[PDB]
Ligand binder design. Structure first.
Ligand SMILES: Nc1nc2c(ncn2[C@@H]2O[C@H](COP(=O)(O)OP(=O)(O)OP(=O)(O)O)[C@@H](O)[C@H]2O)c(=O)[nH]1
Ligand SMILES: Nc1nc2c(ncn2[C@@H]2O[C@H](COP(=O)(O)OP(=O)(O)O)[C@@H](O)[C@H]2O)c(=O)[nH]1
Ligand SMILES: Nc1nc2c(ncn2[C@@H]2O[C@H](COP(=O)(O)OP(=O)(O)O)[C@@H](O)[C@H]2O)c(=O)[nH]1
Ligand SMILES: Nc1nc2c(ncn2[C@@H]2O[C@H](COP(=O)(O)OP(=O)(O)O)[C@@H](O)[C@H]2O)c(=O)[nH]1
Ligand SMILES: [Mg+2]
Ligand SMILES: [Mg+2]
Lengths: 439, 58, 108, 430, 430, 430
């Protein structure tokens, strides 16, 4: 009876969900076509799969998700792929003209003719539900189309539904390797868009995942499909507790009350471990003591930020597998007693411990090995300032020469908006510094 | 940097409310002369004599 | 404090070497039956661990599976008697009839 | 005849109740389906204390289970002994507390108490002569403490002459289980002291600590934790249910364990408890038990009694034993340890004798003593609280559901006042 | 009544204690599998001297097992008759002594001795009327010299009335097992004389000499050596377990043997002992046993009496016998060897008899020696100590763990002082 | 009545007096403003020993601050309790001493020492009858040792009947501060030996060792070290300000510690000093006070007293407690360790009891004793100095300020005699 609705927008968002739904598909045994393969399924109290899938009255299931993009090639790719029969035919809305890396295009000119349909479809999904908990939004910040349709859909959410809890996994371009040359502009403009309209967001800059993948799986040449699977892992973790039997439980609504100390500071970076390939897999113990340490290690950060420069604010821990309470109690005991990681003077206890029982599954033909102990971490630390400043620099330099500004004035967006956004980013940097000082 | 002495040994444990802290035993031991009615049963004096010492000890 | 080398040779019998005491030393005889009795118990289960030694630490204790009326009957532990498989969907919810509401009553 | 209705709420509440019934179930010898299979007559004579009557001779517990989220209740129904509770007493929400007190005490908690408050009154009136209540909940948890405290508050306003009890679990700063624990833990007691006649504090840290160095089992689980508390819960009512030399009802413990109306916190401990490997290497005589009851280690309370200075305490023995060594020893331990007891309360220990031991032994001890050391928890609970308040950290959540800053400070003053009294009633001489 | 305690530490202590407990179990009738299979009712009459009672009629020995290395505890437990010992009596660390005294009395022991004291105190207070303590340890080793002695000081300070027993295997210059043997042993004598009331040294090299000559066994092993000592101290405590014509207790032994407080060093022996060749060719009468008792090679210490003079010596006979023969033989040995007994004390030999001898022999004799020959033993070790210390060889280990050379110099001075004060009486005349 | 005066020479005198006047104020209860906020009447009974009365009831500590450095002097004024000193007593030079003795004793200091003489004399008549001078300075520093001693030299000139006392902090070998260390410490004793009636040397390392071992504080600061002495200073005169069983003014201590006129150096130590994490248990009963008092580790002087013999002992029990243990334990300790006590002074330990111990305790004792150990302190310093002379390095500064080779030689012979004359009586026999 507990259900959620997922929202992915933009080409990058389109594919990332593809990997996540492949994992979600295998977790509950749904066949690729949409029919139960066991053929032994019984009724009564077996509808624990309502969290993501929904019965269709007769036969298959539909994934309660919506795909929105302005460029047809990516969307059509899923339509004619092996997963054709799964999705609802009309829930994969597609556009005609691409935004073309112009944030103005995706939020004032072409975007306003596609958001109308998107809200309608979400209306159909929610009504079917009964205990709607919240949404999950994935977007690619470093693009004009991703930000505009990605952003504008968010504001419409702020007014039609209201207080429903909502989360977003944004992807800010990397500090030193990035595709778009106009990435800084729409990135900063986005920073305003989600700052006071989203409750929580996690940083997943792609550079780190290459770093994490290179140092664990031994693979030198990952592709964008590889990166997708790991993110599909974190999403499964953050929501797993909601849908399986456990001794200690945390729900989606629980996170918003133990990770955001103030409304303004609503950014946090996640980490994952262990990630051990098949080769290296066996020759360890995967003991809780060694696993818990790896999570805090800087080498595993999924956002290119080093917690050491600054202090921590609040950390949430979700375990899965056959972990036991003593194993956790000692681990947190060890971490605090160390000196390399230190906390602020106003957070005496800041750990939220969760425990599940269903072990994570291994995707076919993937890279993650099959293990029993795992840790999914979402930590909000004052150090996150590094992401904005590095982006902070890149935006100002263009404006001083007023380079490329003219295609941003070619769709009607006022020249003053850029001035407004720059001020808000300055405020956010101010706040991050202030919280970390001593009493 | 805590300037000056910044002495922090705290030799005394502190927080001990010794209400008899500054009472010179030269005073009480000679001049209590309290209660101890003119009772004749030796035990009755015995107990009342038994108590006076404890209060003096504490 | 010694190695129980049991052989014919009079210089390595121990038994033939520890009878100078006043009486029949209570030590060798009790030790012997231990080796014999353990073998029979192993045959009941079957271990053949290349020697009776690898089976000579944990086949003599008397800690019974149940208490002797000196402590709470908490047992050996919940995790001790736990059997676990590791297939998908093993630990899914059941949604018992207690909370299995279907009609959502409207009037109070 | 003095039947007590047992109510517990919260996830931490469910498990304690989920298994505690197991211990009481085995004592009177009731099977899973509700059919009696007793061996003696006594075990069924005084059975009205916890069980009602039903057709077919099956007995159903007079329990009220309360929670705001579906996960906790459903699981307890699936396990063994889960068929005893009647479906009527069940009451549950559809939203979730979210580890926020106010969401469990003003908005979500309020809009459901009408249903729950209705069932509780039905049970009370059903009894011939209500003798008291008994509540187990979590102060650091949301649904437990969230609306758990409020129900207790209202109940007092309706049944003034009855006796109230509580088994509260408050987080210790050793093992943290919720970032916001200091808030909901610190402000709950304020509504607790003014309404709870008796409170018994048991901290999970002590329960975990007792496991390694008493029982010596390599890997403990939550199942082990519940059982230890389950028996101790029986100790308070041990003599009330079976015949004995010197009966002692629930109030009788209140009369001899409350020096003042504002000091109603104790600590409970259970003896004997010897490790598996030491199952047969011990003597079940009075001398052995007495050492375990008063030892600083055995108490399930985070506060060490030895730093403290006892005011009053009670002992609830079980099983057939003589009266010399129950009485004579009580004199010896007190006399040889007079340096740690009040000097203006003579004969400050209560002794009771009941002659039906727990299933599987021949002697048991249930101790519930009030030592000035219990101040230790409050000082540390508040101490961490103050660090979290000077910055208004995490305070925005609590101001979005109708509460104002006035309650927070006013509650803080009440706690600090409670801390002061304990010290005052110790550093004084006749 | 008149019950005692046993504390064994270090590898040698554990070995000797295990052998002694095996022998005592044999004598009293205790089986590994603990139940009673003894025949004579006399055995169970006073079995409480060295044993308690437990639920199920299973006897437990009031021993204490302790050490800083895990193997020794693990090894004795694995072997038969080590399963009688109380696991709760097991206390140990995970570091190891490594033949360093300071490691055994200052740094590590202080952290772990806290637990040990509690166990000993509780066990001792449990019994009704104590009689003393008999401790087994080693002075040439690392753990034994330090951990036990520290225990000795604390126990003596706590309980200033009950007497104590000690069994020390001092090293000798014939066979050596450590290159630093003199230091830890020499410092041992400095602290032990002031507290240990009774001490009965034991010398290994005498063991091999006695093993090779009288026994004539071709290949002896540790089991052979440990076995003898068990006999000696089992016989020293014979009258206190069995009736007799003239009971003599521990306090009786000390009072008749120690003239002055500083002279409390003894040497012991055992009889009868016969080589496997000539077992059945000799009888069992007071004459033969008394003749073998005073022999130079029958003693149990490296000291040779014939170069010294006895001050006081007591004989604890076992089994039936004709008393007049006992008295007559003692005087005859006294008169025919007046040169070996000092003059200013008349009747410097004691006697005692008990009604039950060890299983498997008609009678046996246990002898305790207090003669000036013990001066040589200390002198030789003093010779080694000075040579090792002049160059300060190996001194850096002990200087680097908080010890000071002032303590070493004080100990070296003390040993010479005792040697002189004890050798004085040999030339002193009335 | 029977009052003294304070003369602090230099920062060491500045800080040592900086804290001591801070520590004392609490003992007699004086606020930062000099306003009384005490509780009992006795606290003002003898507050006149160190304080003078003025209009407005404010009290005034009668101290005079002397030094040649303005950077340090003013620092105390800005700090708390630095305003207890009247500005009038502020006397100071303008150039400093430059760690060179001569610049502080013949050319510069002699030029300005006149003014302090007037104030020091002025303070004398203010009191009823002067009792003595206790002066804290530094021998290892120039300014204190340069013009300080000259202050001590003439003070006794005008009052040949009043006695004077000194705290001295002498250079130690492990950690050095000044390269003029051999000179300033060496010659300076020449004037102090013939001038000061009582000298109580104190060594800085011992604080580290005392703070590192018993205090266990990870990081001491000069403030922490200053405190250790501050209590120490209060121990000598403690019985001078309140009632007592056997009040012992500075006179009695003087007549009970000096065997002969030339030996006026003492070694002291304070205790108990519990660790930072001292658990609340038991009480500092008399038995433990004696043991920690005589520990060689607690002594403040670098020379270990066990290297020689004690000439006599003086103890000052603090708090309310009977003297029988004072009579016995003071007697008991002497017998056990009589190997370190000289012969021809039978009963060579003094006893004193006071009823006003330091705040936050129940009992305590301050140790003052003179033992031949200090021979090592002057000896090793002698070797350092002797190597300096023929070396003839760093003498040009000392030869360039009005003095020549004759002055240096005379002191060395004086101290060479002092070391010898200190050792002659060490080996003397009765
Ligand atoms: N992690 C991850 N990021 C991707 C992947 N594919 C694209 N991206 C992100 O997408 C960014 C480029 O913009 P896109 O989102 O791909 O393109 P778009 O949003 O459709 O914008 P337009 O091209 O104008 O339509 C890159 O910086 C990547 O960070 C992927 O497979 N994995
Ligand atoms: N000892 C013990 N503690 C428990 C158990 N279940 C829950 N808890 C405690 O309850 C706390 C979490 O309570 P929570 O579920 O948030 O309470 P709720 O929000 O009212 O449902 C944790 O800190 C645990 O310490 C249990 O079975 N044993
Ligand atoms: N007679 C005898 N002596 C032993 C035996 N085992 C060890 N020793 C002696 O004990 C000494 C070693 O002491 P040790 O156990 O290492 O002391 P520790 O390091 O403090 O435990 C050696 O010099 C041996 O002579 C034994 O079985 N019999
Ligand atoms: N115990 C102690 N000794 C100190 C302190 N400050 C300085 N000293 C000692 O004083 C000596 C040097 O004195 P100095 O600085 O020349 O005094 P000044 O010239 O008058 O300032 C050093 O050897 C230190 O050991 C302190 O706070 N405590
Ligand atoms: Mg695109
Ligand atoms: Mg006088």
């Amino acid at each position: 009876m507990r259900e959620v609705i997922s929202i992915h927008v933009g080409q990058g968002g389109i594919q990332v969900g593809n990997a996540c739904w492949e994992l979600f598909c295998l977790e509950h045994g749904i066949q690729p076509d949409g029919q139960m393969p066991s053929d032994k399924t019984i009724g009564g109290g077996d509808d624990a799969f309502n969290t993501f899938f929904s019965e269709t009255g007769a036969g298959k299931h539909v994934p309660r998700a919506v795909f929105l993009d302005l460029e047809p090639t990516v969307i059509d790719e899923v339509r004619t792929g092996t997963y054709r029969q799964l999705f609802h035919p009309e829930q994969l809305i597609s556009g005609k003209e691409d935004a073309a890396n112009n944030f103005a295009r995706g939020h004032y000119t072409i975007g306003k003719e596609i958001v109308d349909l998107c809200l309608d479809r979400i209306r159909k999904l929610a009504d079917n539900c009964t205990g709607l908990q919240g949404f999950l939004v994935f977007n690619s910040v470093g693009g004009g189309t991703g930000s505009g349709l990605g952003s504008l859909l968010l504001e419409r959410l702020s007014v039609d539904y209201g207080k429903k809890s909502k989360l977003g996994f944004t992807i800010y371009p990397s500090p030193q390797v990035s595709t778009a040359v106009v990435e800084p502009y729409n990135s900063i403009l986005s920073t305003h868009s989600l700052l006071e309209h989203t409750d929580v967001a996690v940083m997943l800059d792609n550079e780190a995942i290459y770093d994490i993948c290179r140092r664990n799986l031994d693979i030198e040449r990952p592709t964008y499909t590889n990166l997708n699977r790991l993110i599909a892992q974190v999403i499964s973790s953050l929501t797993a507790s909601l849908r399986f039997d456990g001794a200690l439980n945390v729900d989606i609504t629980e996170f918003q009350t133990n990770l955001v100390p103030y409304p303004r500071i609503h950014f946090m970076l996640s980490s994952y471990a262990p990630i051990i390939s098949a080769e290296k897999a066996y020759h360890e113990q995967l003991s809780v003591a060694e696993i818990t340490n790896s999570a805090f290690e800087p080498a595993n950060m999924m956002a290119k930020c080093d917690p050491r420069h600054g202090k921590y604010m609040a950390c949430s821990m979700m375990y899965r597998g056959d972990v036991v309470p003593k194993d956790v109690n000692a681990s947190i005991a060890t971490i605090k007693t160390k000196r390399t990681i230190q906390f602020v003077d106003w957070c005496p206890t800041g750990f939220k411990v969760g425990i599940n029982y269903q072990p994570p599954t291994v995707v076919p033909g993937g890279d993650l090995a099959k293990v029993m102990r795992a840790v999914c971490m979402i930590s909000n630390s004052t150090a996150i300032a590094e992401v904005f400043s590095r982006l902070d620099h890149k935006f100002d330099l263009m404006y001083a020469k007023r380079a490329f500004v003219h295609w941003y004035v070619g769709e009607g967006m006022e020249e003053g908006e850029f001035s407004e956004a720059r001020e808000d980013l300055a405020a956010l940097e101010k706040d991050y510094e202030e919280v970390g000082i001593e009493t | 940097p805590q300037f000056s002495n910044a002495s922090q040994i705290e030799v005394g444990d502190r927080s001990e409310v010794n209400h008899r802290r500054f009472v010179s035993q030269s005073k009480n031991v000679y001049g209590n002369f309290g209660k101890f009615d003119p009772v004749s049963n030796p035990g009755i004096l015995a107990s009342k004599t038994k108590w006076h010492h404890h209060l003096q000890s504490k | 404090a010694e190695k129980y080398k049991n052989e014919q040779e009079p210089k390595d019998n121990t038994s033939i070497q520890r009878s100078w005491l006043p009486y029949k030393d209570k030590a060798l005889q009790v030790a012997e039956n231990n080796l014999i009795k353990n073998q029979t118990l192993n045959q009941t289960k079957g271990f053949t661990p290349f020697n009776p030694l690898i089976t000579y630490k944990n086949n003599m204790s008397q800690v019974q599976q149940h208490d002797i009326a000196t402590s709470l009957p908490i047992g050996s532990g919940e995790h001790s008697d736990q059997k676990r498989t590791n297939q998908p969907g093993e630990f899914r919810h059941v949604r018992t009839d207690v909370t299995l509401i279907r009609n959502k009553p409207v009037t109070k | 005849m003095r039947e007590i209705v047992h109510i517990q709420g919260g996830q931490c509440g469910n498990q304690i109740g989920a298994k505690f019934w197991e211990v009481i179930s085995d004592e009177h010898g009731i099977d899973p389906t509700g059919t009696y299979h007793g061996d003696s007559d006594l075990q069924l004579e005084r059975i009205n204390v916890y069980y009602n009557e039903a057709t077919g001779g099956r007995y159903v517990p007079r329990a009220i289970l309360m929670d705001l989220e579906p996960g906790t209740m459903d699981s307890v129904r699936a396990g063994p002994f889960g068929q005893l509770f009647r479906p009527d007493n069940f009451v549950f929400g559809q939203t979730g507390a979210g580890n926020n007190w106010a969401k469990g005490h003003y908005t979500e908690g309020a809009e459901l108490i009408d249903s729950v408050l209705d069932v509780v009154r039905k049970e009370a009136e059903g009894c011939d002569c209500l003798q008291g209540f008994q509540i187990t909940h979590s102060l650091g948890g949301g649904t437990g403490s969230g609306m758990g405290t409020l129900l207790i508050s209202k109940v007092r306003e309706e049944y003034p002459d009855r006796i109230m009890e509580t088994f509260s679990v408050v987080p210790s700063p050793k093992v943290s289980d919720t970032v916001v624990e200091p808030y909901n833990a610190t402000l709950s007691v304020h509504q607790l002291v003014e309404n709870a006649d008796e409170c018994m504090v048991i901290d999970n840290e002590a329960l975990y600590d007792i496991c390694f160095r008493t029982l010596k089992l390599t890997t403990p689980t939550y199942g082990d934790l519940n059982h230890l508390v389950s028996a101790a819960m029986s100790g308070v009512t041990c003599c009330l249910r079976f015949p004995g030399q010197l009966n002692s009802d629930l109030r009788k413990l209140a009369v001899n364990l409350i020096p003042f109306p504002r000091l109603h916190f104790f600590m409970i401990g259970f003896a004997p408890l010897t490790s598996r490997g030491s199952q047969q290497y011990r003597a079940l005589t009075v001398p052995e038990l007495t050492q375990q009851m008063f030892d600083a280690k055995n108490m399930m309370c985070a506060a060490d009694p030895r730093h403290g200075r006892y005011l009053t305490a009670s002992a609830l023995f079980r099983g057939r034993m003589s009266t010399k060594e129950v009485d004579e020893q009580m004199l010896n331990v007190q006399n040889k340890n007079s340096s740690y007891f009040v000097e203006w309360i003579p004969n400050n220990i209560k002794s009771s004798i009941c002659d039906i031991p727990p299933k599987g032994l021949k002697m048991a001890v249930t101790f519930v003593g009030n030592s000035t050391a219990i101040q230790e928890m409050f000082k540390r609970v508040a101490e961490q609280f103050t660090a979290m308040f000077r910055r208004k950290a995490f305070l925005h959540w609590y101001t979005g559901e109708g509460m104002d800053e006035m309650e927070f400070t006013e509650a803080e003053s009440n706690m600090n006042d409670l801390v002061s009294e304990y010290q005052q009633y110790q550093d004084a001489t006749a």
